[PDB]
Swiss-Prot record, chains A, B:
One of its GO terms (biological process) is phosphate ion transport. The chain crosses the membrane at residues 1-30, 36-67, 81-108, 115-136, 160-193, 198-231, 233-263, 267-294, 314-345, 348-385. Changing S257C: Decreases phosphate efflux. Decreases phosphate efflux. The chain holds residues 230 to 625 of 696 of the full protein. The keyword Repressor does not apply. Residues 68-80, 155-159, 232, 295-313 are cytoplasmic. Inorganic ion transporter that mediates phosphate ion export across plasma membrane. Plays a major role in phosphate homeostasis, preventing intracellular phosphate accumulation and possible calcium phosphate precipitation, ultimately preserving calcium signaling. Binds inositol hexakisphosphate (Ins6P) and similar inositol polyphosphates, such as 5-diphospho-inositol pentakisphosphate (5-InsP7), which are important intracellular signaling molecules involved in regulation of phosphate flux. Widely expressed. Detected in spleen, lymph node, thymus, leukocytes, bone marrow, heart, kidney, pancreas and skeletal muscle. Changing Q336A: Decreases phosphate efflux. This is Solute carrier family 53 member 1. It is linked to Basal ganglia calcification, idiopathic, 6: A form of basal ganglia calcification, an autosomal dominant condition characterized by symmetric calcification in the basal ganglia and other brain regions. Affected individuals can either be asymptomatic or show a wide spectrum of neuropsychiatric symptoms, including parkinsonism, dystonia, tremor, ataxia, dementia, psychosis, seizures, and chronic headache. Serum levels of calcium, phosphate, alkaline phosphatase and parathyroid hormone are normal.
Length: 385, 385
């Protein structure tokens, strides 16, 4: 309508200037004799979520304009849809809340409450806005999201729809948010509660491995449930392998990290095995994305050199840019592991992680941007008809 | 359209949060051993202009919705109109520039330029955005405004249209902006130009009197030109009297102020004469506004107790609220003069002036809100047909 567009404008404006204020306050008012990592490590989750919602708004716009309809694919209702302006405004609202909480963490405005209650309040509100039992604030769509989250987190007990698969895949890309939330739990359980601001931050007690692999587990058991429902082995078990490689990569990385902390002689072999398993996982997921989840590299593409037989997005350069971006964004782990194992600053692993997490969300953006199109065109996953 | 509404939202959001930041920086970072008056006295002009443009946007909305059409009255073009969202976004843009300049005056961001260049740059841009000789930034409407300003400031040489009269009246209400601009000229001509930040601020050399009465002069000579064009004495010379009273009030206030500064014995008589002349001016303009410029208090109003015979604005309470607001806003000078002449803080006259100038702009808001309606209904001024 019109009021929705005006609210998109209001929230986007407040957000851009809050970001300017936040950058300025971070460059200037950053004495911070204490360590600042227990703050950005807790706010990385909110940041990844807000960036993901912005990019999902852009995805919905691209779908609706290019021609690929997501009202039938997603099993939504042909009317009472959710345009992209709605996603933009709700992401902007969560961004306003994120920036306000972060500013309250920078300047301590109120002198009676400690500065550790602002992340707690921000995430408590982000949860209450989603479990809101009233008849307001996107009642229908938000409760559809709740039904979807309940049917995807209890995966091997329900029939696989396209929304289930799609949200399981999104959660498989946003693993840093789950790591963030479990880290916030661990911290607020294991930190002094007097005036300011370790066991976790490391893979010591294995909770990091479980939390990082739980979306891979979701998608793995989901595709196994689909293979039990139907009877076909090509796009089900070859798909389960892609998420078994994530299991193995996380396990070996955890063992290597704990052995490097303990300094045992079993560190180099586990490091090499982590290297080779992330290599096979990245090659696997790259081939899969370029072959099935996108349908590219078709056998009879005609004048289109490396594409399908037909296309929806007008500029053919978009697809080549997407191929390059998906082979660069994925495989960016090499820079990470090299710069962390070539004698850099002590606190640099988290620098690289925070730098490359929004880049991973961008990769998931592009992947959606093309997967919904391929699903509308070729019906890759046998979800309908 | 839609992009215009989104830009209204963007600018309104940036503006509200810039206002919050500005209020906070004014309450907290206000050491300011020096006097702060040469800053708010220079920014009051921009503030009154931005508030006036917001309220003119609201006026255009009220006109277009209530039914009173301003496309024929204002001699504009029935197509290529200017909706209220355009006024809102351009006022928001000037507000963004105002808030940015004021913040740059609070925090000195750049260390090489003195803090007196920001008001100069703000108003230089406000003038360049209006004299812009390109084919962009509201080319047609802005050059219509230039033609109107040139035909109204050279009043006694052109035929009086409704736009001429209306802008002369608006300028007759926004006299504080002209006082502000002449004061900025005087200051930047009579202030040290080394690192920071009197003859004016007072009515000493009479420039304040001339500047404060020049819109009254505009409207007076304009109604005299109209009386020469037509031949009718009721709504022309009785109208010229209303702006002759402003001449007399300003003259007597200037004489009283200069004699109080010089402490002569002629101060009390001039103060009493200023009192009585502002009394007669306020009663005159109140009776005129309630009788002719609004058409209220009709002789045959029917069931409507104190109104016209017909009305356009639905809630009848709006009109009574407007009568009360126009008899309160006008006549607010009594509080000013009493609190300034009953032994209050030295710097309090400018406090009261800055407090009551936006209130005067609000009075002009309501006056327009009803005058355009009465003009569409009864054709009070013989402007058409």
């Amino acid at each position: 309508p019109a009021w929705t567009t005006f609210r998109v404008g209001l929230f986007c404006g407040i957000f851009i200037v809050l970001n300017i204020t936040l950058v300025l306050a971070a460059v200037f008012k950053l004495e911070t004799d204490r360590s600042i990592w227990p703050l950005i490590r807790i706010y990385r989750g909110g940041f990844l979520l807000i960036e993901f919602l912005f990019l999902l708004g852009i995805n919905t716009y691209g779908w609706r304009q290019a021609g690929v309809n997501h009202v039938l694919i997603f099993e939504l209702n042909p009317r009472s849809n959710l345009s992209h302006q709605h996603l933009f405004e709700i992401a902007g609202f969560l961004g306003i809340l994120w920036c306000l909480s972060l500013l309250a963490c920078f300047f301590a405005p109120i002198s009676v409450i400690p500065t550790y209650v602002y992340p707690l309040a921000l995430y408590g509100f982000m949860v209450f806005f989603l479990i809101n039992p009233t008849k307001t604030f996107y009642y229908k769509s938000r409760f559809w999201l709740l039904k979807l989250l309940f049917r995807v987190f209890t995966a091997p007990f329900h029939k696989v729809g396209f929304a289930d698969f799609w949200l399981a895949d999104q959660l498989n890309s946003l693993s840093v948010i789950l790591m963030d939330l479990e880290y916030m739990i661990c911290f607020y359980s294991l930190e002094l509660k007097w005036d300011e601001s370790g066991i976790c931050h490391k893979y010591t007690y294995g909770v990091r491995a479980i939390v990082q692999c739980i979306p891979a587990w979701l998608r793995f058991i989901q595709c196994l449930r689909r293979y039990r429902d139907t009877k076909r082995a090509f796009p089900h078990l070859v798909n389960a392998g892609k998420y078994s490689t994530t299991f193995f990569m996380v396990t070996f990385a955890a063992l290597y990290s704990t052995h490097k902390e303990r300094g045992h002689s079993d560190t180099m072999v586990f490091f090499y095995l982590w290297i080779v398993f992330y290599i096979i996982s990245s090659c696997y997921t790259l081939i899969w994305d370029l072959k099935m989840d996108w349908g590219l590299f078709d056998k009879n593409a005609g004048e289109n050199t490396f594409l399908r037989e037909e296309i929806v997005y007008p500029q053919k350069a978009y697809y080549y840019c997407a191929i390059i971006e998906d082979v660069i964004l994925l495989f960016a782990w090499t820079i990470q592991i090299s710069i962390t194992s070539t004698t850099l600053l002590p606190h640099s692993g988290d620098i690289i992680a925070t730098v490359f997490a929004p880049l991973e969300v961008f990769r998931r953006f592009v992947w959606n941007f093309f997967r919904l199109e391929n699903e509308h065109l070729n019906n890759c996953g046998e979800f309908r008809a």
